[PDB]
Amino acid sequence: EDDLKTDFYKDLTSLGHNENQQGSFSSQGGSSFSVYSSKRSENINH
Structure with a gap:
């Protein structure tokens, strides 16, 4: 007998996630x- 069985x-x-975000309120x-x-006078930047 010669019996050889193999599995590989x-x-x-x-996975990749990449996000770039900006928000401006003026x-x-x-x-x-x-x-x-x-x-x-009034000036705001958020």
């Missing part, structure tokens, strides 16, 4: 007052 199993899995305001005087 290989599994490979690979608000500006100015008001001017006349006759008295005033000036008022």
Whole structure:
């Protein structure tokens, strides 16, 4: 008798995740007052 049995199993899995994100919020305001005087201004960046 000569009986030879063999198995080879290989599994490979690979995964990739890559994310690049930006968000900008920009608000500006100015008001001017006349006759008295005033000036008022606002600038935000989020």
